[PDB]
Design a protein around this ligand. Structure first.
Ligand SMILES: Nc1ncnc2c1ncn2[C@@H]1O[C@H](COP(=O)(O)OP(=O)(O)OP(=O)(O)O)[C@@H](O)[C@H]1O
Ligand SMILES: Nc1ncnc2c1ncn2[C@@H]1O[C@H](COP(=O)(O)OP(=O)(O)OP(=O)(O)O)[C@@H](O)[C@H]1O
Ligand SMILES: [Mg+2]
Ligand SMILES: [Zn+2]
Lengths: 442, 259, 521, 25, 109
């Protein structure tokens, strides 16, 4: 072993699960659950059969406001559905014991296809899933309803949409949780593409599970970026454990201690807990009082501050029952903590900078959209390495339906597709179980 | 437990910042503006009529079972279900008692479920309408956080935070929401915070004298109290900057030995 | 069979037995009436049955007996025990005891509907259709099912003229009917209705009532309905209780109970005549149009010429949506007219009032007070603060207490009740105590022109006669002019003298309240 | 009451009298 | 009261009720009436006080012959009242002076 840090795992209700769990048991490089979620995200494709039928019936191929007269096909994709799914499964099949899975969603109007891992083992990128599904769906539609040879281009345009001209799937009816790898903000940014609303809808508006999902994706992405390599790996593992997985029940304890409280009371409880646990000590006392504080464990202090950040967002957005407060809570939590202790904030100011980004992105005419569409693959929100996004999930889970960008408006298909998997609907419980399965190997 | 300090420093400005940050410090009140007058200057709703709603009350709407979400007690305006409104303030650099970052920090330290925003010549707090009116009357308007001359409740056109005061000591207003009545010596709001005229002008009180404004301000000035007279705040700022730099370079205990 | 039992429950609020010795039994389908005076405990009892926070019993308990699926969390009617689920499993019968943290509680709480008193549980910005659509989708149904219902439903509460109209911009009883149509559309096991009709006019009240029957009594959903206005208790309930100050004064067949209750009652006080004095207000061609690029024009007031003659009580009667609240807001200089003249004879000069400012509308607005139909108080302040410090009383704070007590007594509270009510919050009052407090808040500043949008609506005949003699005494001893919007006819006969009828933004004819009555019928 | 009339006559801060800048000329 | 010029000042009775006797104000010198000497405990009898700018009736002076724990000598709460002085020797004349009559004071330090 290389890390002597032990954590105690708790469930979403605050009950103890296990003690003295090694810190690397929740690592993305060791946890089987996190590996399974990464593979499932890489290989799951969502297909809108009703959208394909509507696009082909009206000739609505192209993009926004685009319509080609004369290129209309009257097929019944929703009515057949099972035959199309069987054809797609047969085309995508590699071995007989394959993981090819084309299931029917909402009575034939949607498809949830999982391409086999054999096609991803010999692929340098995750885009093989969507391209293979598009090709299988085109072949299934052409063979099921006898499409003329001169209308296969129309079928392709309805399924994928402007792909050879626009390197993206814009006007099509096929979707994935990950965008195009050429449309990333930086290299290794593929896993920070799931927005807040998708995580909230996948977890069925559960607070701790959405936090765990967002934190697992963000910290696995920091491992993918090469950020959590060497001396930063311990800080990212501690951040994941204490912010997303509720290590030592810190988030639940801070929320329980600040049920009637404010953000400043959360800051006070965080400082009290860090002093009591020995994470921070008094550096020196100035002339005007104000005993300065220094971290005895820098990464553990960062993890404690991140857990308190999540708890402060939960407390303020549960008091207001509105998800518009996330930016101010993160910004002034970090500000109050820094000028109360003389200690650095979460991610050494990167969380505060990303909170300023959230502020100008969700509170002005210069802004655009609400906090539900926050993802780490955006230039506004990329700066914090997995420490500012998981609180936004708690904020959107605490929202009492006062946001235009509600999870119901933007992520209904995503929730209906990815809520069927147990490790996605309840990421916290299954990540804890996967950590429990590999305790003895450390 | 942990006794919370709030701000470093020995000067009067640092003491005022600590007092603003302290939720257990009772701010000294200096005027009485009635609740309906604060509502009228706010300009969101007619006084006497019911609050407009954005969603049904929380008992009526059905949510999923969430243990962590239900631990936090919601606000009363969130319980009934009310629209989220705002109140915006401009603060002069010439010894206004409250300052934008100080305002935001004190609001987020003292109030529950608020949305604070800080600009150079602007500061806005958003909350549910009933609770927002409650702390607008109780804290924001009648206490030593407000001066009708050097501060002003104003949305829409904001300008004059860095300009000099007029002949009556008031902050410049391009829309002239509040004027000076020399017969009573009081400042009267003739328009609401966004700019439409009021049917009856509302007395927000008289300007605070400059001698009191020197004692109750939270800004550092060369003609008042400068940061060179407060070396403890500069040392804390430099320590925060160095800790951020060392954490961004390599976040280990051995690299923080040179802190 | 039996749906819920009520054991001997005595609800207390700090030496305040709001309720004591309350016990009744219900079966699968029956309408139960809760009849009583104002402040008797009907809203407390309905929030008690709903299981809202703060309404936990101190002495007794209530048992809910339901059906249940252990794999689906669907609660149902107890009659379903023996039938086949909408899932696997058959069913299981549960004696959910509320206030006992019995899991099912959550599912059962979802399966019960409540019509809150003077509170519109609607999304506001989600129109009328999407508000009802939400109800269906939320509760279940499906595209077609929802659509069918949505349309079939909007017909019942009568809202086809406001379909795409934003529900925030609706008008009182229209929001009441919207909340109602949201409340049937969940398939409840019980519909608890607190003042289901509202301050609704006879005709619209009849539609609401039939809609209720058309639906809840068809699906044999038990009904708990309160109205301290009997004629509905009879036409709806078969078994009704009469309670007085939290104690069941009687428990019988609804007919006998309503009889007995109505005997306890009093007649009006037909005051002495009064001569009025000169014209004060003159509105000439007042129009108010709400134009949308997405819903059409709503000509709320469509050309209205009225005159008020100074010390007099003026009535405005009509149907729901006629334009009475828009007119009263135009009089109070709250809502400017799209077109038309309004002059107020301050003393002899007629200030043009569609001109904002102290130099113009302000002049008369110092002496204009309005009580809104959708009224409110300050919930973070006490009642004494609400009368004295919240609005600004021109007197020292030591002497404002007895002024507020005198105003509350003049409104129709006793000395003990007004003394006990002063150190209290508006959330601790009843709807009707809050209404009288808001009326006192309007009256305490002593304005000249007073606009009262539905002073009654939740007052026993006795409380209503009280508020009435109040207005009459203040008009004569203080020569205060009043403009009254009301739906109770006998209030207009024994209070008003020159009422006017409003129909679609028009004035039709103005005259005596009896003449208005024979014009109406 | 006599005391109510005395308080109303003695403590009536008339806006036209107190704020002549706005309500007059 | 005029003690800046002469040795005997004049106070005019403005309003009276049982124990309370409020004096007239000057709406020319009541400008910088910041809260200065605000009571901390119950006000004792024979205390002269002026209401500061917090209350609506700023500048009015008054005195009461009894003690209460809630209201100052002018009917306002303690945060709206600043104590300026007290009556030391001569009493039982504030209960026998009508409204509008002038009483004369002498400073004894
Ligand atoms: N939270 C509370 N705390 C204390 N007393 C309360 C509270 N809520 C209601 N009350 C009192 O309990 C009594 C019953 O009130 P309730 O609202 O049930 O009256 P009601 O019979 O519905 O009358 P109304 O016709 O006015 O609606 C009243 O005296 C009311 O003031
Ligand atoms: N702001 C608004 N925008 C659009 N239409 C409105 C608006 N306010 C009211 N209306 C419509 O104008 C009509 C008149 O409304 P008003 O409130 O004046 O009615 P009313 O006669 O008082 O009825 P009620 O008895 O329900 O109070 C109603 O149909 C209402 O929906
Ligand atoms: Mg009630
Ligand atoms: Zn079932």
């Amino acid at each position: 072993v290389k890390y002597e840090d032990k954590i105690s795992l708790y469930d979403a209700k605050g009950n103890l699960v296990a003690e003295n769990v090694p810190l690397e048991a929740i690592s993305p490089l060791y946890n089987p659950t996190i590996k399974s979620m990464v593979k499932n995200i890489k290989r799951t494709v969502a297909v809108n059969l009703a959208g394909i039928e509507g696009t082909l019936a009206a000739g609505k191929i192209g993009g926004k406001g685009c319509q080609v007269p004369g290129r209309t096909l009257d097929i019944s994709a929703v009515s057949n559905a099972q035959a199309i799914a069987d054809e797609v499964e047969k085309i995508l099949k590699v071995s007989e014991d394959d993981d090819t899975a084309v299931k029917i969603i909402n009575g034939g109007k949607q498809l949830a296809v999982q391409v086999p891992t054999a096609r991803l083992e010999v692929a340098a990128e995750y885009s093989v899933s969507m391209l293979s599904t598009a090709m299988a769906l085109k072949e299934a539609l052409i063979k099921t309803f006898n499409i003329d040879m001169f209308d296969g281009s129309t079928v392709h345009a309805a399924i994928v949409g402007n792909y050879p001209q626009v390197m993206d799937y814009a006007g099509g009816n096929i979707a994935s949780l990950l965008g195009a790898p050429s449309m990333m903000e930086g290299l290794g940014y593929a896993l920070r593409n799931i927005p807040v609303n998708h995580a909230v809808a996948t977890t069925k508006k559960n607070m701790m599970n959405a936090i765990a999902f967002s934190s697992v994706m963000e910290q696995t992405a920091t491992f993918e970026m090469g950020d959590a390599v060497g001396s930063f790996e311990r800080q990212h593992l501690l951040g994941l454990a204490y912010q997303g997985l509720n290590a030592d029940n810190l988030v639940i304890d801070f929320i329980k201690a600040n049920a009637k409280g404010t953000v400043g009371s959360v800051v006070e409880t965080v400082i009290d807990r860090a002093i009591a646990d020995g994470v921070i000590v008094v550096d020196k006392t100035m002339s005007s009082g104000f005993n300065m504080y220094k971290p005895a464990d820098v990464n553990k202090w960062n993890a404690y501050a991140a857990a308190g950040l999540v708890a402060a967002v939960a407390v303020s957005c549960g008091a207001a029952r509105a998800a518009q407060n996330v930016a101010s809570v993160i910004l002034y939590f970090n500000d109050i903590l820094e000028y109360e202790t003389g200690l650095p904030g979460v991610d050494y100011g990167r969380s505060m900078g990303t909170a300023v980004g959230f502020s100008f992105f969700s509170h002005s005419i210069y802004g655009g959209g609400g906090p539900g569409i926050f993802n780490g693959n955006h230039v506004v929100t990329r700066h914090s390495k997995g420490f500012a996004i998981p609180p936004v999930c708690a904020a959107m889970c605490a929202d009492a339906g006062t946001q235009m960008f509600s999870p119901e408006h933007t992520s209904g298909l995503v929730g209906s597709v990815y809520s069927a998997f147990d490790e996605f609907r309840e990421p916290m419980k299954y990540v804890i179980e996967g950590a429990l399965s590999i305790k003895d190997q450390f | 437990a942990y006794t919370p300090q709030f701000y470093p420093g020995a000067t009067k400005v640092a003491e005022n910042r600590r007092n603003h940050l302290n939720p257990n410090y009772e701010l000294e009140k200096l005027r009485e503006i009635p609740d309906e007058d604060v509502v009228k200057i706010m300009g969101h709703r007619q006084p006497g009529e019911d609050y407009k709603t954005v969603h049904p009350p929380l008992e009526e709407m059905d949510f999923v079972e969430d243990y962590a979400r239900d631990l936090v007690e919601p606000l009363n305006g969130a319980k009934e279900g009310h629209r989220v409104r705002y109140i915006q303030f401009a603060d002069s650099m010439y010894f206004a008692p409250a300052q934008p970052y100080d305002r935001s920090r004190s609001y987020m330290s003292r109030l529950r479920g608020v949305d604070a925003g800080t600009l150079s010549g602007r500061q806005v707090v958003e909350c549910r309408e009933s609770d927002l009116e409650e702390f607008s009357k109780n804290i924001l308007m009648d206490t030593e956080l407000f001066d009708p001359a050097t501060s002003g409740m104003r949305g829409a056109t904001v300008h004059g935070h860095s300009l000099r005061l007029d002949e009556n000591g008031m902050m410049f207003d391009a829309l002239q929401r509040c004027v000076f009545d020399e017969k009573t010596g009081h400042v009267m709001y003739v328009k609401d915070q966004v700019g439409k005229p009021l049917d009856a002008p509302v007395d927000v009180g008289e300007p605070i004298p400059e001698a009191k404004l020197r004692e109750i301000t939270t800004i550092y000035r060369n003609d008042g109290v400068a940061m060179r007279a407060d070396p403890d705040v500069i040392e804390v700022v430099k320590r925060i900057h160095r800790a951020r730099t060392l954490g961004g370079y390599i976040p280990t205990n051995e690299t923080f030995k040179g802190l | 069979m039996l749906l819920l039992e009520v054991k001997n429950v005595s609800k207390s609020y700090g030496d305040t037995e709001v309720l004591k010795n309350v016990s009744f039994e219900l079966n699968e389908g029956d309408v139960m009436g809760v009849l009583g005076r104002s402040g008797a405990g009907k809203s407390v009892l309905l929030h008690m049955l709903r299981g809202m926070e703060g309404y936990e019993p101190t002495s007794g308990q209530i048992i809910y007996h339901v059906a249940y699926c252990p794999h689906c969390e669907n609660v149902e009617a107890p009659s379903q025990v023996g039938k086949k689920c909408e899932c696997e499993t058959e069913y299981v019968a549960k004696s959910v005891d509320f206030w006992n943290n019995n899991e099912i509680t959550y599912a059962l709480k979802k399966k019960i509907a409540i019509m809150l008193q003077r509170t519109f549980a609607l999304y506001g910005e989600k129109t009328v259709a999407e508000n009802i659509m939400e109800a269906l989708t939320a509760a279940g149904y499906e595209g077609k099912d929802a659509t069918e219902w949505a349309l079939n439903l909007i017909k019942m509460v009568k809202l086809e003229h406001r379909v795409a109209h934003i529900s925030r911009d609706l008008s009182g009883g229209e929001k009441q009917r919207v909340v109602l149509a949201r409340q049937i559309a969940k398939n409840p096991v019980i519909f608890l209705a607190d003042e289901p009709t509202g301050t609704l006019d006879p005709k619209t009240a009849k539609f609401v009532h039939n809609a209720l029957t058309e639906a809840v009594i068809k699906h044999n959903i038990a009904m708990v309905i309160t109205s301290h206005w009997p004629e509905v208790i009879e036409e709806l309930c078969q078994k009704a209780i009469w309670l007085d100050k939290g104690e069941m004064r009687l428990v019988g067949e609804s007919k006998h109970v309503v009889e007995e209750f109505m005997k306890t009652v009093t007649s009006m006080k037909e005051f002495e005549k009064v001569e009025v004095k000169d014209e004060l207000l003159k509105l000439e061609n007042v129009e108010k149009r709400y134009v949308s690029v997405d819903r059409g024009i709503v000509k709320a007031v469509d050309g209205i010429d009225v005159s008020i003659n100074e010390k007099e009580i003026f009535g405005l009667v009509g149907v729901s949506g006629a334009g009475k609240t828009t007119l009263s807001k135009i009089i109070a200089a709250v809502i400017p007219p799209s077109k038309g003249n309004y002059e107020f004879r301050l003393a002899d000069e007629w200030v043009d009032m569609t001109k904002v400012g102290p130099l113009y509308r302000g002049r008369a607005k110092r002496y204009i007070g309005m009580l809104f139909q959708e009224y409110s108080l300050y919930p973070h302040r006490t009642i004494l603060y609400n009368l004295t410090e919240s609005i600004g009383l021109e007197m020292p704070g030591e002497f404002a207490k007895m002024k507020a007590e005198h105003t509350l007594v003049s409104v129709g509270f006793t000395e003990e009740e007004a003394e006990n009510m002063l150190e209290k919050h508006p959330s601790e009052l009843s709807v009707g105590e809050k209404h009288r407090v808001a009326l006192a808040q309007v009256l305490i500043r002593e304005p000249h022109l007073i606009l009262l949008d539905e002073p009654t609506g939740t007052m026993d005949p006795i409380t209503r006669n009280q508020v009435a003699e109040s207005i009459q005494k203040s008009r004569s001893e203080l020569d205060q002019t009043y403009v009254i919007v009301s739906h109770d006819m006998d209030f207009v006969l024994n209070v008003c003298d020159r009422a006017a009828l409003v129909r679609g933004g028009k004035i039709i004819k103005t005259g005596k309240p009896d003449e208005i009555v024979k014009i109406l019928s | 009451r006599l005391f109510l009339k005395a308080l109303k006559e003695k403590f009536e801060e008339d806006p036209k009298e107190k704020y002549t800048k706005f309500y007059t000329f | 009261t005029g003690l800046t010029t002469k040795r005997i000042g004049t106070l005019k009775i403005y309003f009276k009720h049982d124990d309370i006797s409020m004096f007239e104000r000057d709406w020319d010198y009541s400008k910088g009436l910041l809260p200065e000497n605000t009571p901390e405990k119950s006000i004792d009898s024979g205390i002269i006080a002026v209401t500061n700018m917090v209350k609506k009736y700023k500048g009015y002076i008054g005195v009461r012959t009894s003690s209460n724990d809630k209201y100052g000598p002018t009917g306002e709460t303690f945060e709206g009242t600043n104590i300026v002085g007290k009556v030391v020797k001569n009493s039982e004349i504030l209960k026998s002076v009508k409204q509008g009559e002038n009483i004369y004071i002498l400073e004894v330090n």
